[PDB]
């Protein structure tokens, strides 16, 4: 079959890592300073 | 902290008008690391003074919500 040659090729490719910046926890995300706080008079 | 949370019940049992003591029952319960009794007083509490304006019980619920993080719409709230 003597036709137009294109090739067929479905692009399902995984990216890579992104590896974004982190955040950074509050002082009261951590139990201690939360129990500091709570406890206040 | 077990002398104060029972001078709190003592208090809150002879009038129950005293929000602060059960707020400070409440953070008794906190600083024995009775977290859960203290999530269950609260609710209790809430659910039987939704018109009430405790504006610092609604904080700590929110700070609470937000530990246990499954409540977060209530935290929100």
Known sequence: ?41 | YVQAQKQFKQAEDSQNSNTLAKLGYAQCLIARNEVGDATIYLEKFFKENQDSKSSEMMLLLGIIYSQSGKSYYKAII
């Open chain 1, 1 to 41: 079959r003597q036709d137009y040659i294109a090739k067929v090729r479905y692009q399902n490719d995984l990216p890579a890592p992104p590896c974004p910046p982190k955040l950074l926890k509050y002082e009261i995300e951590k139990e201690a300073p939360q129990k500091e706080f709570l406890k206040d008079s």
